[PDB]
Amino acid sequence: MNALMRLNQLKPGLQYKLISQTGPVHAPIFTMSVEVDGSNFEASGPSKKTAKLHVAVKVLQDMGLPILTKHGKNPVMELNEKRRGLKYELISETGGSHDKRFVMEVEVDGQKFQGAGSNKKVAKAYAALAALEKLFP
RNA sequence: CCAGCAUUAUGAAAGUGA
RNA sequence: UCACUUUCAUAAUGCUGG
Protein backbone atom coordinates (compact mmCIF):
# COMPACT_ATOMS: atom_id res chain seq x y z
CA MET A 1 0.00 0.00 0.00
CA ASN A 2 2.94 2.34 0.72
CA ALA A 3 3.81 4.92 -1.97
CA LEU A 4 7.55 4.25 -1.68
CA MET A 5 6.88 0.56 -2.31
CA ARG A 6 4.34 0.97 -5.09
CA LEU A 7 6.00 3.96 -6.83
CA ASN A 8 9.28 2.08 -6.91
CA GLN A 9 7.48 -0.99 -8.20
CA LEU A 10 6.49 1.17 -11.15
CA LYS A 11 9.52 3.42 -11.42
CA PRO A 12 12.54 1.36 -10.48
CA GLY A 13 15.88 3.03 -9.82
CA LEU A 14 14.41 6.45 -9.20
CA GLN A 15 16.34 9.47 -7.76
CA TYR A 16 14.81 11.44 -4.89
CA LYS A 17 16.41 14.77 -4.04
CA LEU A 18 16.48 16.81 -0.83
CA ILE A 19 15.99 20.48 -1.58
CA SER A 20 15.75 21.91 1.90
CA GLN A 21 15.69 21.27 5.62
CA THR A 22 13.85 23.88 7.62
CA GLY A 23 12.73 24.27 11.23
CA PRO A 24 14.54 23.78 14.60
CA VAL A 25 16.59 20.63 15.14
CA HIS A 26 14.11 18.95 17.47
CA ALA A 27 11.34 19.63 14.89
CA PRO A 28 12.96 19.52 11.44
CA ILE A 29 11.06 19.81 8.15
CA PHE A 30 12.48 18.01 5.15
CA THR A 31 11.40 18.51 1.59
CA MET A 32 12.12 16.14 -1.31
CA SER A 33 11.30 16.29 -4.96
CA VAL A 34 11.43 13.83 -7.80
CA GLU A 35 10.91 14.06 -11.60
CA VAL A 36 8.79 11.38 -13.18
CA ASP A 37 7.21 11.23 -16.63
CA GLY A 38 8.47 14.79 -17.07
CA SER A 39 6.69 16.18 -14.01
CA ASN A 40 8.57 17.42 -10.90
CA PHE A 41 6.79 16.88 -7.57
CA GLU A 42 7.75 18.38 -4.23
CA ALA A 43 6.45 17.22 -0.80
CA SER A 44 7.65 17.87 2.74
CA GLY A 45 7.73 15.56 5.77
CA PRO A 46 8.94 15.44 9.42
CA SER A 47 11.85 13.24 8.42
CA LYS A 48 13.71 12.17 5.29
CA LYS A 49 12.09 8.73 5.23
CA THR A 50 8.55 10.15 5.33
CA ALA A 51 9.02 13.23 3.24
CA LYS A 52 9.62 10.76 0.45
CA LEU A 53 6.42 8.78 1.20
CA HIS A 54 4.57 12.05 1.01
CA VAL A 55 5.97 12.76 -2.48
CA ALA A 56 5.47 9.33 -3.81
CA VAL A 57 1.88 9.62 -2.61
CA LYS A 58 1.51 12.80 -4.58
CA VAL A 59 2.95 11.08 -7.67
CA LEU A 60 0.64 8.09 -7.46
CA GLN A 61 -2.39 10.42 -7.15
CA ASP A 62 -1.49 11.77 -10.60
CA MET A 63 -1.18 8.32 -12.11
CA GLY A 64 -4.45 6.81 -10.98
CA LEU A 65 -5.03 5.89 -7.33
CA PRO A 66 28.11 -13.25 -6.33
CA ILE A 67 29.15 -16.86 -5.64
CA LEU A 68 28.45 -19.19 -8.60
CA THR A 69 29.06 -22.71 -9.95
CA LYS A 70 30.94 -23.86 -13.04
CA HIS A 71 27.59 -24.29 -14.77
CA GLY A 72 27.46 -20.51 -14.31
CA LYS A 73 24.61 -20.92 -11.87
CA ASN A 74 23.97 -20.27 -8.20
CA PRO A 75 24.37 -23.56 -6.31
CA VAL A 76 21.15 -23.35 -4.37
CA MET A 77 19.17 -23.81 -7.60
CA GLU A 78 21.37 -26.63 -8.82
CA LEU A 79 21.05 -28.31 -5.42
CA ASN A 80 17.25 -28.14 -5.54
CA GLU A 81 17.30 -29.37 -9.14
CA LYS A 82 19.08 -32.59 -8.13
CA ARG A 83 17.67 -33.25 -4.63
CA ARG A 84 14.32 -31.47 -4.65
CA GLY A 85 13.31 -30.79 -1.03
CA LEU A 86 16.66 -30.85 0.72
CA LYS A 87 16.50 -28.91 4.00
CA TYR A 88 19.19 -26.54 5.25
CA GLU A 89 19.94 -25.93 8.94
CA LEU A 90 21.52 -22.97 10.79
CA ILE A 91 24.38 -24.38 12.83
CA SER A 92 26.06 -21.22 14.14
CA GLU A 93 25.29 -17.50 14.18
CA THR A 94 27.76 -15.18 15.73
CA GLY A 95 27.99 -11.55 16.71
CA GLY A 96 25.02 -9.24 16.93
CA SER A 97 26.50 -5.83 16.12
CA HIS A 98 28.86 -5.62 13.18
CA ASP A 99 30.53 -8.79 11.84
CA LYS A 100 28.17 -11.76 11.75
CA ARG A 101 29.11 -15.23 10.56
CA PHE A 102 26.47 -17.91 9.92
CA VAL A 103 27.25 -21.62 9.51
CA MET A 104 24.50 -23.73 7.93
CA GLU A 105 24.44 -27.49 7.19
CA VAL A 106 22.87 -29.48 4.39
CA GLU A 107 23.06 -33.29 4.38
CA VAL A 108 22.49 -35.10 1.11
CA ASP A 109 20.55 -38.20 2.16
CA GLY A 110 23.92 -39.72 3.11
CA GLN A 111 26.49 -36.99 2.58
CA LYS A 112 26.44 -33.71 4.54
CA PHE A 113 27.96 -30.31 3.90
CA GLN A 114 28.54 -27.05 5.76
CA GLY A 115 29.44 -23.45 4.87
CA ALA A 116 30.00 -20.09 6.61
CA GLY A 117 29.15 -16.58 5.40
CA SER A 118 28.26 -13.03 6.36
CA ASN A 119 24.64 -13.42 5.25
CA LYS A 120 22.61 -16.52 5.92
CA LYS A 121 21.84 -16.74 2.26
CA VAL A 122 25.63 -16.72 1.56
CA ALA A 123 26.59 -19.25 4.25
CA LYS A 124 23.88 -21.49 2.80
CA ALA A 125 25.17 -21.26 -0.81
CA TYR A 126 28.74 -22.11 0.20
CA ALA A 127 27.39 -25.18 2.00
CA ALA A 128 25.72 -26.13 -1.30
CA LEU A 129 28.71 -25.47 -3.58
CA ALA A 130 30.88 -27.62 -1.31
CA ALA A 131 28.42 -30.52 -1.38
CA LEU A 132 28.07 -30.21 -5.15
CA GLU A 133 31.75 -29.82 -6.12
CA LYS A 134 32.62 -32.74 -3.88
CA LEU A 135 30.06 -35.33 -4.88
CA PHE A 136 28.65 -34.67 -8.38
CA PRO A 137 31.29 -33.38 -10.88
C1' C B 1 25.51 0.74 10.15
C1' C B 2 24.99 -5.08 10.90
C1' A B 3 21.46 -9.10 10.86
C1' G B 4 16.45 -11.77 10.87
C1' C B 5 11.13 -12.70 9.36
C1' A B 6 7.27 -11.21 6.07
C1' U B 7 4.87 -9.06 1.65
C1' U B 8 5.19 -6.91 -3.59
C1' A B 9 7.97 -6.20 -8.56
C1' U B 10 11.56 -7.54 -12.36
C1' G B 11 15.41 -11.65 -14.15
C1' A B 12 17.34 -16.56 -14.61
C1' A B 13 17.23 -22.31 -14.08
C1' A B 14 14.16 -27.17 -13.27
C1' G B 15 9.20 -29.95 -13.69
C1' U B 16 3.76 -30.41 -15.44
C1' G B 17 -0.30 -29.10 -18.82
C1' A B 18 -2.36 -26.86 -23.42
C1' U C 1 4.02 -19.08 -27.13
C1' C C 2 0.43 -19.17 -22.45
C1' A C 3 -0.86 -21.06 -17.31
C1' C C 4 0.62 -23.46 -12.60
C1' U C 5 4.70 -25.26 -8.88
C1' U C 6 9.70 -25.29 -6.97
C1' U C 7 14.79 -22.70 -6.40
C1' C C 8 18.08 -18.61 -6.76
C1' A C 9 19.79 -13.38 -7.78
C1' U C 10 18.28 -7.89 -7.60
C1' A C 11 15.06 -3.95 -5.65
C1' A C 12 11.53 -1.83 -2.62
C1' U C 13 8.45 -1.53 1.72
C1' G C 14 6.95 -3.00 7.08
C1' C C 15 8.43 -4.71 11.92
C1' U C 16 11.94 -6.89 15.39
C1' G C 17 16.88 -7.81 17.65
C1' G C 18 21.90 -5.75 17.96
Residue ranges covered by each domain of chain A: 1-65, 66-137
Rg value, chain A, Cα: 23
First to last CA, chain A: 47
Distance CA A104, CA A130 (A): 12
Longest Cα–Cα distance in chain A:
65
A65: three-class secondary structure by DSSP = coil
CB A84 under 7 Å to nucleic chain C:
yes
Please name the helix (run of DSSP H) or strand (run of DSSP E) that holds residue A29, with its range, or none.
strand A29-36
Nucleic acid strand B: bases within 7 A of protein CB: 1-5, 7-9, 12-14
CB A38 under 7 Å to nucleic chain C:
no
A31 has which bridge partners? A20, A44
CB A11 under 7 Å to nucleic chain C:
no
CB A77 under 7 Å to nucleic chain C:
yes
Distance CA A46, CA A27 (A): 7
Q: Which residues of A46-69 are buried (b: 16+ CB within 10 A; e: fewer)?
A: eeeeebbbbbbbbbeeeeeeeeeb
CB A71 under 7 Å to nucleic chain C:
no
Contact A129, A69 (CB under 8 A): yes
Distance CA A62, CA A43 (A): 14
Distance CA A78, CA A82 (A): 6
